[PDB]
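Researcher: I've got a protein sequence and the SMILES for 2-acetamido-2-deoxy-beta-D-glucopyranose. Could you write out the 3D structure of the bound complex as structure tokens? I'd like something to compare against our soaking experiments later this week.
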Amino acid sequence: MIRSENITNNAKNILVQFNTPVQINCTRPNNNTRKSIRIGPGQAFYAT
Amino acid sequence: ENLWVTVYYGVPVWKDAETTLFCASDAKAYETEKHNVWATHACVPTDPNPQEIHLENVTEEFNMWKNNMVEQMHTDIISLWDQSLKPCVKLTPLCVTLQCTNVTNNITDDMRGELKNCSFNMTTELRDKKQKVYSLFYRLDVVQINSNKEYRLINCNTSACTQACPKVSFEPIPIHYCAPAGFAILKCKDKKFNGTGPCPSVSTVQCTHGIKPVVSTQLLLNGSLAEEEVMIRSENITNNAKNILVQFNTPVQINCTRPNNNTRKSIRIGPGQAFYATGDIIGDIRQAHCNVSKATWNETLGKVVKQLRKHFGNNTIIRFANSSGGDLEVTTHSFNCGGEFFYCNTSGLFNSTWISNNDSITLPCRIKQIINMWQRIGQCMYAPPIQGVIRCVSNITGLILTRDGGSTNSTTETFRPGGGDMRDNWRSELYKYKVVKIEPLGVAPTRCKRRV
Amino acid sequence: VTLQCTNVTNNITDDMRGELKNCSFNMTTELRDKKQKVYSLFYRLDVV
Amino acid sequence: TETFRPGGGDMRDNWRSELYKYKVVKIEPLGVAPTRCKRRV
Amino acid sequence: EIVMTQSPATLSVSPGERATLSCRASQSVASDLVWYQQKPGQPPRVLIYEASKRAAGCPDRFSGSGSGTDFTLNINSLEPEDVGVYYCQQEIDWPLTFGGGTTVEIK
Amino acid sequence: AVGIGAVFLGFLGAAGSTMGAASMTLTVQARNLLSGTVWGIKQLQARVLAVERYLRDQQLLGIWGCSGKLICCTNVPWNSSWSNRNLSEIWDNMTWLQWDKEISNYTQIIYGLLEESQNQQEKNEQDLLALD
Amino acid sequence: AVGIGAVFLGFLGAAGSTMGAASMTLTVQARNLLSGTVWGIKQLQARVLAVERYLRDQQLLGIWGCSGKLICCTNVPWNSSWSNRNLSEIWDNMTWLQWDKEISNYTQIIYGLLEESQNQQEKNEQDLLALD
Amino acid sequence: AVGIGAVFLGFLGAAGSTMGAASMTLTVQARNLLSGTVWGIKQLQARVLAVERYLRDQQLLGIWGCSGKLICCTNVPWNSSWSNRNLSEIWDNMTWLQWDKEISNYTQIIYGLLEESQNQQEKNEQDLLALD
Amino acid sequence: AHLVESGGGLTQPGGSLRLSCVVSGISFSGHYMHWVRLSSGRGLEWVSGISDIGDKRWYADSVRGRFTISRENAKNTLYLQMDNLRPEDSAVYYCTGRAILYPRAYYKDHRSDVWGAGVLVTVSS
Amino acid sequence: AHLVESGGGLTQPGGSLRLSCVVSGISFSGHYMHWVRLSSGRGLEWVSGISDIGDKRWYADSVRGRFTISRENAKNTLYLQMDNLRPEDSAVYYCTGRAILYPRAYYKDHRSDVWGAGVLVTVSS
Ligand SMILES: *[C@@H]1O[C@H](CO)[C@@H](O)[C@H](O)[C@H]1NC(C)=O
Ligand SMILES: *[C@@H]1O[C@H](CO)[C@@H](O)[C@H](O)[C@H]1NC(C)=O
Ligand SMILES: *[C@@H]1O[C@H](CO)[C@@H](O)[C@H](O)[C@H]1NC(C)=O
Ligand SMILES: *[C@@H]1O[C@H](CO)[C@@H](O)[C@H](O)[C@H]1NC(C)=O
Ligand SMILES: *[C@@H]1O[C@H](CO)[C@@H](O)[C@H](O)[C@H]1NC(C)=O
Ligand SMILES: *[C@@H]1O[C@H](CO)[C@@H](O)[C@H](O)[C@H]1NC(C)=O
Ligand SMILES: *[C@@H]1O[C@H](CO)[C@@H](O)[C@H](O)[C@H]1NC(C)=O
Ligand SMILES: *[C@@H]1O[C@H](CO)[C@@H](O)[C@H](O)[C@H]1NC(C)=O
Ligand SMILES: *[C@@H]1O[C@H](CO)[C@@H](O)[C@H](O)[C@H]1NC(C)=O
Ligand SMILES: *[C@@H]1O[C@H](CO)[C@@H](O)[C@H](O)[C@H]1NC(C)=O
Ligand SMILES: *[C@@H]1O[C@H](CO)[C@@H](O)[C@H](O)[C@H]1NC(C)=O
Ligand SMILES: *[C@@H]1O[C@H](CO)[C@@H](O)[C@H](O)[C@H]1NC(C)=O
Ligand SMILES: *[C@@H]1O[C@H](CO)[C@@H](O)[C@H](O)[C@H]1NC(C)=O
Ligand SMILES: *[C@@H]1O[C@H](CO)[C@@H](O)[C@H](O)[C@H]1NC(C)=O
Ligand SMILES: *[C@@H]1O[C@H](CO)[C@@H](O)[C@H](O)[C@H]1NC(C)=O
Ligand SMILES: *[C@@H]1O[C@H](CO)[C@@H](O)[C@H](O)[C@H]1NC(C)=O
Ligand SMILES: *[C@@H]1O[C@H](CO)[C@@H](O)[C@H](O)[C@H]1NC(C)=O
Ligand SMILES: *[C@@H]1O[C@H](CO)[C@@H](O)[C@H](O)[C@H]1NC(C)=O
Ligand SMILES: *[C@@H]1O[C@H](CO)[C@@H](O)[C@H](O)[C@H]1NC(C)=O
Ligand SMILES: *[C@@H]1O[C@H](CO)[C@@H](O)[C@H](O)[C@H]1NC(C)=O
Ligand SMILES: *[C@@H]1O[C@H](CO)[C@@H](O)[C@H](O)[C@H]1NC(C)=O
Ligand SMILES: *[C@@H]1O[C@H](CO)[C@@H](O)[C@H](O)[C@H]1NC(C)=O
Ligand SMILES: *[C@@H]1O[C@H](CO)[C@@H](O)[C@H](O)[C@H]1NC(C)=O
Ligand SMILES: *[C@@H]1O[C@H](CO)[C@@H](O)[C@H](O)[C@H]1NC(C)=O
Ligand SMILES: *[C@@H]1O[C@H](CO)[C@@H](O)[C@H](O)[C@H]1NC(C)=O
Ligand SMILES: *[C@@H]1O[C@H](CO)[C@@H](O)[C@H](O)[C@H]1NC(C)=O
Ligand SMILES: *[C@@H]1O[C@H](CO)[C@@H](O)[C@H](O)[C@H]1NC(C)=O
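Model: Sure. Here is the predicted complex with 2-acetamido-2-deoxy-beta-D-glucopyranose in place.
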């Protein structure tokens, strides 16, 4: 289903709705390590 | 035979419910200009003549361990303590290195290494200039970091403290928790009520009596006394992990004082922020102590043991031991005497054995300023010093006891003081109250139909 | 603060060339008097 | 030809795809209408 | 329980003629009696609920009346579509038993 | 000023009595139902719920025909599934609390019968009666 | 009356039916008008707005001669300038929404004659001609 | 009855007028009694107070036999100890504000006299033979 | 309560005129405004009229279509446009308003029939 | 308003079966559900009956105690778990629903009486 307000005008977005869900897998191929750096009294800064 | 439904409005019908309860207090402690941590100037003025109405043939079931009034009260206590500190100074520039020397100065009789004379570099109104000021901290407030040793505060690793407001007072005044119109607060008037089960004497008072929000561990302070005997109330008396709340028939008077004559000095740590620090104690330096009368405490412990023989074993010996361990709020007895937070040893009181067949007990206390209240790791409050000699007279109206694992079944019952959880403190005064919602609508058949 | 950053070029990466930066900087500790010298990995989109 | 490119930016367009079928109305229970009925004195 | 006694099992009448049915009772049923139609191969459906009032979709030919013990079902115009088995079941006591069964065949 | 002395039973005082005695004290538990930073929020949140509970009670008393009546007679018959006791075991052997715990499932069948099948009929019947 | 159940209509169920058939569902839509801190003020202003709307509707209903009245007859005469169409075209041929769209211009005028030219006149006559 | 407008009297439009003439503005004064972070909780409190002040004017009126009534008769005698004149010098030459300004002390003892000699006295007479 | 008028004048047939009736005192929103002209031989005859709520304009049988009536509740003015004129329209035009004060028992006279000072328009070749 | 009931089968006597009637369209929680079986000679014999509000169950005198009935309002499913079978129980079983639609003049037919299609239970040795 294609939904738009004024689809003859190019300045309006077109919200397309799907019938079947296209599956997408997203990953980060990195084993980061969270390191807590204490920056103040009761404050921490978690860094890579 | 020709039964028609009829509507009755105003029937005496209630069901148990949980609802918000507002505040009420006496107008004598309400019009005063001295502000309290427990805001009371926003409370409703109380009724001069409360309506205590007795119900005949009403047997209602109360449960003090699943009581929502205690949780609502605890939420209100935490909220009030949170919002009363927002206006005061944030003591975040206090986290600097400290060069502390032990105060071995002009008396130092038994306060050997408790008071520390700490000098630190502090900011001022001008951000590019720094001042060298000194303050007298306690041993519980400082910790070493690796003569003039290097120190730091105990909180600076965990949190940043907010200094308490110097004009507010941590004095518990009575608070009446009242239910909205359309609700009711039942009251168990039974004298043998253990906290759970049916109560034959139920009264529908409009709202509760004055419940003072007293901060205490291991010694329930002044409040509601039991009417006839020493009452033991436990959620499960056959459980080793349930606290044993005890009420007292007679109150045990405890006198607590600080013999030091403290001096408050203002250290301006910014544009409009002042750090009220300990100056120099003039006169005599002595350890702060609480004394409990030995004749009264022995009779009171004797009444506790005698009423504890029914629950466990009538020939089983009862032995009182000191606290096991943990944090200072659980290990020692903590309270609030005029704004100064004590942490008193209870080894003098809970040291006895009881076979089935005129002095004072001096308790050595330990004053701490930087405290972690309500066991919240991340929020701390700095109590400012109070100049002059302080003294409190208080009624020990109860105990919080923790039982260890039963050795060889029922041979000896070792009871130690517990505490730590602040919901057990409000349970000693809200045990007899519960909140019900009232449904006045009711349908019932009669022989009368509507005349058309 | 003034982050002193270098390119990573560790392991074998992949030509993620110039995407991760190894930044070392002076950060305050719990005490106001003392300072730390900690290091952290920052993406190229975060650092200027 | 009609060249289409992806958009984005306005975050409200994500929730227009879920809230397109719902709308909120207020309800007025009072109403007047003519009959032959009149009340007594 | 309130036993239900019905008419004889066959009242086969040629179409276009008014057919009259009835079913008896042991004790009083008052106004709570219904009627059903089960075609062969079809689940049953109601005709006259509360012994006087027609259901939805039923034609004007199906009419029922009666109170107390004796009740009557009146079929004004008979149709070849109206072949089926007739039942009446009480609804004032608890067991809710049905009728014996009356089968009308098309002549 | 004939007749001297004044003692009231108090609010909810007939709760242990039977329904035949607690239905004679309906004025006491009706007049006292409303009677007209934190602790500024909870006081506000309490006197909103105090008005809402009263108005929900009065709306459900005004949509049936009992607008301002303490004892209200209606036209729905009492079906035997709700209770099988013949009046005596209700009004002389049972309190109102036990009656609430007995008819608690059927508080929506009874209410819908009070509204739709009878009160919405009674106003329309009065409409057709005063039409001519 | 032994094997029957209980199924009700539901809120706004007769919105597509005609006003002659949707005039007997008024008790169904008269129930859900009342329905009994960080972002607790959207739940606290919503519980006062509904109370205010319900009380405004009740007070507007009660300043007429209709106290606790679902279908209330008034002897305010119907004007021909508000709707020229007659009976059997309103109650059998339109729903309530179309009639509301037709009468939304003159509803303030109709409320003014139900208030001023009827109630404070019938109540003044009750305390004058009758009840001395 | 055609070709003429309809202009309504504004709020408090008969403030300065005789009480007989101001007795026909009761619907005018009763319609506008309900009116349909920082700066959000104070007006919420004001709306709750306005709702709770709309009540106790319907709850003082409702406990007597005048609920839903604008002009209500009461069986309570007017003793001459209060400020009393003839009806020609009250309803024809005198405003409502002046009448409130004379009886400013006796209005409280009237409300105590309407809950004692109107109700709980005639109410007990009704309770002598209540249900037939 | 003064219905002051303006506009108009002497114009050849086929011209366009607009008459302005600025109102004061009375409530313009709830007033049914008319337009009645007074001519020699046929004095005080109806022309147009507009409702108080709505924008329904009722006209006479003879002069329908040749006049356009409009009102504005913001500037509190009433208009009448005079297009496609005929020589029988030489008359003085009165701006009048009618409303029923609804208390009716509070108001002794509930007839709010307000009139105004007429302006004279004439049409000739 | 469709009742897709299932179950049945051929089983020796003394066994157990589970007839599940799946309810769609109508309000299941407000409907009074019974069970009616039909065999040769036993014209529409009653089996069981369950309520809509409350869990009171009523059984016939011949089949009392052996059989059990249950329902889930969140699942719209009705079960008649047969136990201790007898050869006279060989019948086709109808999932029956009964309710009165209480706005009884807006509904001209204030009676549901919708019954299921029917599943056949055959028991023999
Ligand atoms: C949406 O559909 C309606 C009815 O089919 C139609 O009138 C309208 O023009 C459509 N709008 C668009 C943007 O397609
Ligand atoms: C849509 O856009 C066109 C031109 O792009 C414009 O003429 C029109 O007014 C717009 N709006 C509509 C069709 O509602
Ligand atoms: C309580 O029960 C006793 C015995 O039935 C009765 O005499 C008494 O009146 C009852 N009390 C109340 C609540 O009236
Ligand atoms: C603490 O040390 C300061 C100097 O740093 C000194 O002036 C002061 O007297 C000392 N106070 C005590 C109690 O020793
Ligand atoms: C404060 O800072 C000065 C230098 O600015 C230093 O000489 C002194 O030792 C410091 N005092 C402390 C850390 O107590
Ligand atoms: C408390 O007393 C009740 C009797 O009133 C009893 O049933 C219950 O077991 C007791 N509970 C404990 C923990 O002693
Ligand atoms: C302590 O108890 C005594 C009774 O022995 C009482 O008079 C006194 O007021 C109590 N003190 C409090 C509650 O602070
Ligand atoms: C109390 O403790 C015993 C033993 O620890 C346990 O069996 C029981 O379930 C507990 N709870 C009660 C009695 O409610
Ligand atoms: C506490 O002090 C009061 C007077 O201040 C005295 O009467 C009482 O005996 C003291 N109690 C103890 C335990 O010292
Ligand atoms: C007083 O305490 C001792 C133990 O310290 C105990 O043996 C003695 O029995 C107690 N006296 C009384 C009267 O209980
Ligand atoms: C405990 O023993 C004593 C005897 O000295 C007796 O009076 C008391 O009732 C006993 N309590 C029990 C068995 O609970
Ligand atoms: C308890 O008393 C014992 C003496 O037997 C002592 O060793 C222990 O440190 C004490 N613990 C506390 C927490 O006071
Ligand atoms: C309490 O007293 C005991 C024995 O007197 C002692 O061992 C202990 O260190 C003291 N302090 C604490 C905090 O337990
Ligand atoms: C208990 O008291 C006795 C004598 O008063 C003492 O010898 C013993 O050490 C004390 N025990 C504890 C744990 O305080
Ligand atoms: C405590 O010190 C203050 C001055 O700081 C003095 O006025 C007061 O008398 C002293 N009190 C005692 C008991 O020494
Ligand atoms: C980043 O540089 C530091 C030296 O400042 C080094 O210790 C660290 O291993 C480097 N990190 C990586 C990922 O190479
Ligand atoms: C950190 O401070 C040192 C001096 O203490 C300086 O040499 C170094 O450049 C600083 N690191 C920065 C600015 O990244
Ligand atoms: C109904 O119960 C009442 C109880 O008083 C009894 O008098 C009456 O006989 C009962 N009716 C039947 C039919 O059992
Ligand atoms: C009415 O009572 C009968 C008999 O118990 C019951 O079967 C039926 O379900 C009830 N109906 C309603 C609507 O309560
Ligand atoms: C009255 O309504 C009927 C509709 O049945 C219509 O035929 C008739 O013309 C109407 N009469 C008038 C005068 O509008
Ligand atoms: C009916 O409406 C007309 C408007 O065309 C108005 O002139 C007339 O006064 C109204 N009738 C009544 C009784 O107000
Ligand atoms: C003001 O007084 C006069 C007295 O003649 C009266 O006519 C007028 O109606 C009064 N004011 C109003 C508008 O009520
Ligand atoms: C009128 O007032 C007098 C004196 O103030 C009093 O005696 C009399 O009872 C009053 N009348 C009534 C009806 O109360
Ligand atoms: C009041 O005026 C009326 C006029 O109708 C008169 O009959 C009556 O006697 C007067 N009352 C007094 C007390 O003057
Ligand atoms: C009402 O009280 C005031 C003050 O006591 C008094 O001046 C006034 O005269 C009183 N009113 C009457 C009508 O007497
Ligand atoms: C209602 O008023 C609007 C605006 O004045 C108008 O467009 C519409 O035609 C009117 N409807 C009726 C039925 O008078
Ligand atoms: C009401 O329902 C509950 C659970 O569904 C049931 O236990 C109870 O018996 C029911 N009440 C009656 C009177 O049947």
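Model: The pocket of 2-acetamido-2-deoxy-beta-D-glucopyranose (ligand 4) is lined by residues B 103, 105, 117, 119, 134, 280 (CB under 6 Å). The radius of gyration of chain I is 15 Å.
Researcher: Great, I'll pass this along to the crystallography team.
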